[PDB]
């Protein structure tokens, strides 16, 4: 009694093809509710020896075992508190702690290791995980390792894999997994009826202003920063909860996603007495009480409970800002389990989060809250990159902060490489090769690339050269006998200024202008500025930025601009 949905057969096929050509671990990205047990079952059926499904969380180990056996198949379990029964079946489910101390039971053939929730590996039970890995690779030197996760990306931690099979890089060489070989988007499950569809309320009455907040190192939000502005706007909290109650009269189950513990307890109070509970992050804490509708409301703070299956949840109310589209999708998905008569799950966002469940995950920290995902084509390979940026109403790009194309390619010989097109770069002083902005040594000639502070410090002390911190630039143009020209004047807050001039008459002059001024100064690298006359440059000065520092050699007529520091991070 097992036939595979098309997307499940695809995940199996992707795994077989990968390991028939490679030894390296790979990861599959599946959302909850996809039916991971069916993929495991068919992989085990085709396997030599046995298959081990390992998981850090013992609670998850027991669920996977349950769902697998519910397919009409047999398996062992190695979890704490359980006793070794008659070993039966081709699959073994276990936890990192239990397996790492019952390693004497794994002296047989294990051809495949499936690690569920593989995004946790860098967090906990790391010594024991190496213990399991060392033992399995000495018994099975050709063992294959498949990762499963619904959350490949975590803010502050990075991506779990480097190469995505659709043609883009996500992590760098430090990524735990070399490859993501299959991904099932949440959009596909909703579109094809594998999950209940969400329906977000378009116009909430009042919502929190969460734009002024500045993220910490991780890109996350501090509890204190969230609380500062929650208490600034706490006269809106009564009104938002009032409408949640109004919507809940037409719904069945209600989850509330609050920002802090201070915010939650306030929320529970405004809710009807005995009609609301709370989920921190002891036990089930009334998990099946909620599913028996002992209470209509269940508030939750930054704690995701693995395994929650509540088809009765008809309503999700998000009152916390979401730092990532991926976090928003894990929150929404908890109310998308199918049920008869459940036409949708109403989503009530009162935090000002964007209205796009299917937005692309940039995968890098935002920086400024007004930035949005923007699409930027690579001039070299044509890959459609997605960077942080800003647009007009029509969608016309104003700025984008991408630095390198994220595409990769692999040649017939099997050699793989990321696209080398660099939207932002620095030239090597010796060989002129284009290098990453952060590089300390040239990639082609290994010459030292001077830090911005050090070059400035030498010219700041040695005043034979001029140094100027730039607050902005002004543009001027005219027309002499050899043709048009454009003069740029760089100035500081105290009025000192350095100027440079570009002629614009000859083809070589125009080419040099684009090479030396536009492409460095442009706000949208990779999208050429269209221009005929110098006045066209002036009209489009919004698309240009000014350097943060200007260094000029105090020589020539008055000075000759030599260095320009863009995107400066350091002393000043
Ligand atoms: N090929 C299939 N045929 C019939 N039912 C399926 C199939 N694949 C998945 N399902 C059903 O879809 C649901 C998957 O939910 P769940 O087991 O929680 O997925 P996961 O374990 O990946 O979170 C289960 O109710 C399961 O019976
Ligand atoms: Mg399953
Ligand atoms: Zn490219
Ligand atoms: Zn060089």
Numbering used by the authors: 2 to 282, 288 to 578
Provide the publication's sentences verbatim.
In prokaryotes, the RadD protein is important for survival under conditions that include DNA-damaging radiation. The presence of conserved “helicase” motif sequences and the overall structure of RadD place it in the RecQ-like subgroup of the SF2s, which typically contain two RecA-like helicase domains followed by a zinc-binding region and a unique C-terminal domain. RadD binds branched DNA substrates and interacts with single-stranded DNA (ssDNA) binding protein (SSB), consistent with possible RadD involvement in processing branched DNA substrates such as replication forks or DNA repair intermediates.
E. coli RadD was purified, crystallized in the presence of 1 mM ATPγS, and its structure was determined to 2.03-Å resolution using the structure of apo RadD as a molecular replacement search model. The present higher-resolution ADP-bound RadD structure shows unambiguously that RadD contains two zinc fingers, designated as ZF1 and ZF2. ZF2 has a typical zinc-ribbon formation composed of two zinc-knuckles coordinating zinc through cysteine residues 434, 437, 448, and 451. In addition to the classical helicase motifs, the ADP-bound RadD structure identified a motif N-terminal to motif I that interacts with the adenine base of ADP. The RadD Q motif binds ADP through Gln9 and Arg6, where Gln9 hydrogen bonds with N6 and N7 of adenine and Arg6 stabilizes the interaction of ADP by Π-stacking the nitrogenous base.
